[PDB]
C-alpha cells in the first residue's frame, strides 16, 4: 500500500516466541517476493525510536546533480588555412547523456525518465607568449533535430529568428537556462529495445524521441592576431523528475555511447567472468582482525 | 492453496499443481487504454477471445552447458494465430501478457531457473563496438540464447536482475512460474514489428543435475496476450 | 550434515540473497567507485560531427 515515509521505521520490543505453525524466518524465494521477516521476528529486540530521515535517497535528490555532458576545446584563431575536420571557431553537439559515465550509469538505473533539463554552460580560455585573456562573447544556439545547423562561424543561421540562442561572456557567471521535457512520449526511453525506423537497416537502441536536439556554440567575436584555446563545458541538472522501472546497475565498463556493448576489464574486479575481485576460498576472510 | 492454479483465457486453460504464488508485474494488471490516455482517434479492434489466449512456443532442451534463453515480446508472437494476423494488418498494438513457464523433473533432480521478464532489454554485443543488428535481435518465435548471462548480455548484472518482475523455478519446490505483465511503454500504443517491450529471460542459475537416469528435461513457454487493442488498419506487409 | 540418496546429486547449491529492511537509511551522497573512464567512449567524437 502506498504511504508517505519521511523517516526510517521504528523497532518494537519483542519477547521469547515459541509458537507452532508460525515460521516468520522461513520464506519462499520462488514466489519472486522479498522476505518479509522482521527484526522483531528473528531476534529479540528493544524499542528504538528511529529518527533517521530518508530524504537524501529521493529520486529528485539522487538525480538533480549538475553533471558534465559535453566538453570541447576548440582553437579560436584565423581558420583560412586549416583542415576540413577542424572546429573553425564553432562546434555542433548532438545532445546526449551517454558520453560521460558517471551521469550515464546513474540515469541507466531506470527504464523511463521524465525530467526538465537545467543546462549550465561553462566556458574557459587559454592563450595558445602571454598577453592576457579576452572577454569573448559566445553564442549557444539550440537547434532542434530537424532544423539546419551552421557551417561557418559567420553563417546566417546564427541570426536565430526562431531558434533560441543565449549570448554570454567568459567573465560572466556561467550561462544557465532550462530545457523542458521535450519528448514526444510521456517519458524518455533510457533503454530502447527496438529499431528507429520502418526499414530493417535502422539503428538499434536509439529512440529518436530521446534526443533533445543540437547545441551549436560559436564565438561571436572575430579573430585576434593571436590564437586561443577555448574550452566549453556543458552541465546538465535533471529536475522535476519522475522515474520508472529500476534496472540492474552496469558493472562492466562502457565501450560506446551508441550501444550497451561490453568487453569488461582484463582481470577482476569488473571483468566479464568475474565482477567481484577474487579471494582464496569461500571460507577465507580477507579483512580479518588479528 | 497457492500451489494449485488454473489460468483460463479464451479457449485455453493451464492447470498446474506445483506453483508458487504468481507474479503481477509492479503490482499492475493489464487493462484496455482509457480515453484520457488515448492518442489514436480511430476506433480500435479488440479481438478478445481470438487473441487473448495462451500461445505455446517451442520447448528448449535444458542441459548441462545451458546458458539461458530469451524471447522478446511481442516479437515471439507476431506470426502466431489471430494475434499475429492482427499485428500484421494493423499499425498499432497495445497488450499485456500472461507468461507461464513450464519445467518439471523428478524429486532426484536439482536446478534453479531465474524466470525474469525484463522491460526494454536493449542488448549489447561482446568485444566489439558495432551495435547488434536486426537478425541478432529479432529472433522471432524461437528466441535466442544468452551469450553471457552473468551480465544479462548488456554489461549489467544477473545478480541484480531480481529488481525486474521475476519468479524462480526451483525443482525442489515448484515446476512452473507465472508472470502477469501490464503494458510497459512510454507510449500508449506502439508499432509491434520494430519495438520489443518485454524480454522473457530464463536462466540456469543452478544447473540441472541428478544421478538417476538422464531423461530430456525441456522448458516450455506459454504466453497469453491480455487486453489487446489494435489501431491503424491497413494491408499486411 | 547434507544427507542425500544415491540417485540425487551429491553436491547441492545455495543461492545467497541480500536486501535492506525498512529501517535502513543512507546519506552523504558521493560518486560511485563502480564506474570510471580514462579515455572517451567510442563514437563520442561523432556527436560533434
Amino acid at each position: 500500500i502506498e504511504s508517505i515515509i519521511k523517516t526510517a521505521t521504528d523497532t518494537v520490543k519483542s519477547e521469547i516466541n515459541a509458537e507452532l505453525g508460525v515460521v516468520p524466518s522461513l520464506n519462499a524465494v520462488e514466489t519472486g517476493a522479498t522476505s518479509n521477516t522482521e527484526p522483531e521476528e528473528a531476534i529479540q529486540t528493544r524499542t528504538v525510536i528511529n529518527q533517521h530521515g530518508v530524504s537524501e535517497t529521493l529520486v529528485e535528490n539522487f538525480l538533480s546533480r549538475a553533471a558534465l555532458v559535453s566538453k570541447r576545446s576548440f582553437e579560436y584563431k584565423d581558420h583560412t588555412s586549416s583542415a576540413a575536420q577542424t572546429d573553425k571557431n564553432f562546434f555542433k553537439w548532438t545532445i546526449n547523456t551517454r558520453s560521460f559515465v558517471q551521469l550515464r550509469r546513474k540515469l541507466e538505473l531506470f527504464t523511463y525518465l521524465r525530467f526538465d533539463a537545467e543546462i549550465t554552460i561553462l566556458t574557459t580560455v587559454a592563450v595558445n607568449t602571454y598577453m592576457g585573456l579576452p572577454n569573448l562573447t559566445l553564442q549557444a544556439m539550440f537547434v532542434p533535430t530537424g532544423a539546419l545547423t551552421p557551417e561557418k562561424q559567420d553563417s546566417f543561421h546564427w541570426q536565430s529568428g526562431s531558434n533560441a540562442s543565449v549570448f554570454f561572456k567568459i567573465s560572466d557567471p556561467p550561462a544557465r537556462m532550462t530545457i523542458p521535457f521535450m519528448c514526444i512520449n510521456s517519458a524518455y526511453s533510457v533503454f530502447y529495445d527496438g529499431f528507429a525506423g520502418f526499414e530493417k537497416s535502422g539503428l538499434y537502441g536509439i529512440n529518436p524521441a530521446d534526443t533533445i536536439g543540437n547545441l551549436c556554440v560559436r564565438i561571436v567575436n572575430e579573430h585576434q592576431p593571436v590564437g586561443f584555446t577555448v574550452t566549453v563545458r556543458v552541465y546538465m541538472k535533471p529536475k522535476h523528475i519522475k522515474a520508472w522501472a529500476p534496472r540492474p546497475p552496469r558493472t562492466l565498463p562502457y565501450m560506446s555511447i551508441a550501444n550497451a556493448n561490453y568487453k569488461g576489464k582484463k582481470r577482476a574486479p569488473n571483468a566479464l567472468n568475474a565482477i567481484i575481485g577474487n579471494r582464496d576460498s569461500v571460507k577465507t576472510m580477507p579483512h580479518n582482525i588479528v | 492453496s497457492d500451489r494449485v492454479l488454473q489460468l483460463k483465457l479464451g479457449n485455453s486453460a493451464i492447470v498446474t499443481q506445483e506453483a508458487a504464488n504468481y507474479c503481477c508485474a509492479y503490482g499492475e494488471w493489464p487493462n484496455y487504454l482509457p480515453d484520457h490516455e488515448a492518442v489514436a482517434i480511430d476506433k480500435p479492434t479488440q479481438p478478445e477471445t481470438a487473441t487473448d489466449r495462451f500461445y505455446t512456443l517451442k520447448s528448449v532442451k535444458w542441459e548441462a552447458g545451458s546458458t539461458g534463453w530469451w524471447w522478446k515480446l511481442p516479437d515471439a508472437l507476431n506470426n502466431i494465430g489471430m494475434f499475429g494476423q492482427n499485428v500484421q494488418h494493423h499499425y498499432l498494438y497495445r497488450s499485456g501478457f500472461l507468461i507461464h513457464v513450464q519445467c518439471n523433473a523428478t524429486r532426484f533432480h536439482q536446478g534453479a531457473l531465474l524466470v525474469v521478464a525484463i522491460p526494454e532489454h536493449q542488448r549489447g554485443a561482446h568485444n566489439t563496438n558495432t551495435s547488434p543488428g536486426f537478425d541478432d535481435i529479432m529472433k522471432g518465435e524461437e528466441g535466442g540464447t544468452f551469450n553471457h548471462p552473468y551480465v544479462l548480455d548488456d554489461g549489467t548484472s544477473l545478480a541484480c536482475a531480481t529488481i525486474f518482475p521475476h519468479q524462480w523455478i526451483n525443482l525442489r519446490t515448484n515446476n512452473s512460474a507465472t508472470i502477469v505483465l501490464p503494458w510497459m511503454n512510454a507510449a500508449p500504443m506502439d508499432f509491434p514489428l520494430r519495438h520489443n517491450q518485454w524480454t522473457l529471460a530464463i536462466i540456469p542459475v543452478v544447473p540441472l543435475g541428478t544421478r538417476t537416469m538422464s531423461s530430456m528435461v525441456p522448458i516450455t513457454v506459454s504466453i497469453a496476450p491480455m487486453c489487446c487493442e489494435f489501431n491503424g488498419l491497413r494491408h499486411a506487409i | 550434515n547434507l544427507i542425500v540418496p544415491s540417485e540425487s546429486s551429491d553436491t547441492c547449491s545455495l543461492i545467497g540473497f541480500i536486501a535492506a529492511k525498512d529501517d535502513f537509511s543512507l546519506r552523504l551522497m558521493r560518486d560511485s567507485p563502480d564506474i570510471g573512464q580514462i579515455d572517451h567512449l567510442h563514437a563520442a567524437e561523432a556527436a560533434y560531427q
Partner: peptide, 29 residues
C-alpha cells in the same frame, strides 16, 4: 519563480510517498 513557465521552477524535493510493495511483494496474495 518569476518566470512564466512552470518547468522553469526549482527542484521539487518534497515527494515522500513510497510503495516498496510494487517491487518487494509483487505477488497476488
Amino acid at each position: 519563480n518569476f518566470y512564466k513557465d512552470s518547468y522553469a521552477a526549482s527542484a521539487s524535493k518534497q515527494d515522500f510517498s513510497q510503495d516498496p510493495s510494487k517491487f518487494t511483494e509483487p505477488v497476488v496474495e
